[PDB]
């Protein structure tokens, strides 16, 4: 309903289409995804907008030019300048069209000069897309150049987005929306290559969050035993009085099954060699409905949520590299546990997490529900639960949010008993560094009773704009 959630949803839909196109092995699956969105009339803002788009805050990180197209934020996958054409003339009759609404600075034009609050942005045209990427003929005062000129003449602000190189395992580039700028002035001159360029001097508008530039409180060098492939440091910056989250808790990477919990019969598995690629041969694919739920991208990404995912298991002929073993693989990301202000322990990531990437299985002691605090995950896809009260992996440190960036996916691999499914946290969204990882616990309101009939309640502090204010 609320604009941020509408944006979130639109971006999830685009991610789904993208990964489907990657799986279908199409060229430029990023662009194909957008084409799918256009076909489905699923572009969130299908008409041009001057100023801010609801739900896209200053600082918003886009993970591709295509994502910007999918939301309607910037409608060309290539062009630096997006503008209202003469089609908008009647709607904006007090302005002269064309009018620019959004530009992208990606450091591709040799005459661009970036000074943060102040920018000198080269017009479009006469630019080599490839090779040396230099100017190769004169520019003209038309199209985007004319559009920016009209912006200057009418005091119409332009959204400005910067490309940034990333040294990340999976994300090469990111685009940050940096707020509105005015076109202060513009002129023509010879560029550094000797051809005419138009130059647009832009000044960031007041009233916006400051442009941002880009070991402390350490309590534990690694909450895992050295067990996780990547260490998980813990910090308390909130309290002197710095006990570590591991106290009273022992880290395990594997489920422990209680005596009174029954171990289901093992699944038969598939007969593929090496890796499972063909949905015809592979029985595990057949279990998934005739298709692989994971795509082989960035070490494996879930295409979309399901009632249950059927992974290759102990008896499958495939080795550990199989893409249908995606959630079984080692921790892919550098994470941190940190003391929050009033949720206690929290987890965040130090690197980018692509949507569909596994974050972790919820590991603990599998107990019968009848035989049983805060760290119990009921398995429902309820007879059984995972008790991470005293022992488990890092999953138990992940907080609830009413607007989560993770989701829970039931996975079967070693057996076919949905009662005892593996519980795996996957990224629902593309996640940026230092963003807290959260999922929706989904306790129904007024769930726990004392009971004198008295409703025992817990206040929620996810800070989300649509918080419903209660865990239960």
């Amino acid at each position: 309903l609320e604009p941020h959630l509408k944006v979130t949803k639109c971006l999830r839909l685009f991610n789904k289409q993208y990964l489907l196109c990657v799986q279908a092995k199409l060229s430029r699956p990023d662009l194909k995804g957008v084409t799918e969105m256009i076909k489905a009339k699923a572009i969130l803002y299908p008409r041009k907008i001057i100023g801010d788009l609801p739900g896209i805050d200053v600082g918003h990180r886009f993970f591709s030019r295509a994502e910007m197209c999918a939301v309607g934020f910037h409608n060309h996958w290539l062009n630096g300048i997006d503008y209202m054409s003469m089609e908008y003339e009647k709607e904006y009759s007090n302005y002269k069209l064309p009018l620019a609404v959004s530009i992208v600075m990606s450091g591709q034009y040799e005459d661009d000069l970036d000074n943060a609050d102040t920018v000198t942005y080269t017009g479009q045209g006469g630019h080599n897309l490839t090779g040396n990427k230099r100017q190769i003929k004169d520019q003209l005062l038309e199209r985007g150049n004319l559009a920016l000129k009209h912006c200057c003449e009418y005091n119409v602000p332009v959204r400005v987005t910067r490309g940034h190189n990333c040294k990340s395992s999976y994300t090469k580039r990111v685009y940050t929306y940096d707020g509105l700028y005015k076109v202060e002035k513009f002129w023509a001159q010879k560029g550094v290559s000797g051809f005419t360029v138009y130059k647009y001097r832009l000044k960031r508008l007041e009233g916006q969050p400051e442009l941002t530039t880009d070991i402390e409180g350490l309590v534990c060098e690694d909450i895992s035993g050295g067990l996780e492939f990547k260490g998980i440091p813990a910090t308390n910056r909130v309290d002197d009085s710095p006990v570590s989250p591991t106290s009273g808790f022992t880290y395990i990477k594997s489920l422990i099954i209680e005596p009174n919990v029954i171990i289901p019969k093992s699944s038969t598995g598939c007969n593929c060699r090496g890796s499972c690629t063909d949905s015809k041969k592979c029985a595990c694919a057949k279990l998934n409905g005739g298709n692989f739920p994971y795509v082989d991208l960035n070490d494996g990404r879930l295409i979309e949520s399901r009632d249950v995912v059927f992974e290759c298991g102990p008896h499958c002929g495939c080795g550990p590299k199989c893409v249908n073993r995606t959630s079984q693989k080692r921790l892919r990301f550098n994470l941190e546990v940190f003391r929050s202000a009033k949720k206690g322990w929290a987890v965040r990531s130090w690197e980018y997490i692509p949507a569909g990437s596994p974050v972790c299985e919820y590991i603990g002691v599998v107990r019968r529900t009848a035989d049983v605090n805060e760290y119990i995950f009921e398995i429902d896809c309820p007879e059984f639960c995972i008790d991470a009260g005293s022992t488990g992996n890092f999953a138990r440190f992940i907080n609830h949010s009413c607007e989560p960036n993770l989701f829970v996916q039931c996975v079967l691999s070693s057996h076919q008993d949905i009662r005892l499914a593996r519980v795996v946290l996957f990224a629902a969204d593309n996640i940026s560094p230092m963003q807290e990882l959260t999922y929706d616990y989904g306790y129904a309101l007024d769930s726990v009773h004392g009971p004198d009939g008295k409703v025992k309640q817990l206040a929620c502090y996810c800070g989300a704009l649509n918080c419903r204010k209660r865990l239960y």
Binding site: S305, D307, F377, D380, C381, P382, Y441
Partner: peptide, 7 residues
């Protein structure tokens, strides 16, 4: 932390 699920 129970609920989930997306056929």
């Amino acid at each position: 932390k129970s609920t989930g699920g997306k056929a």
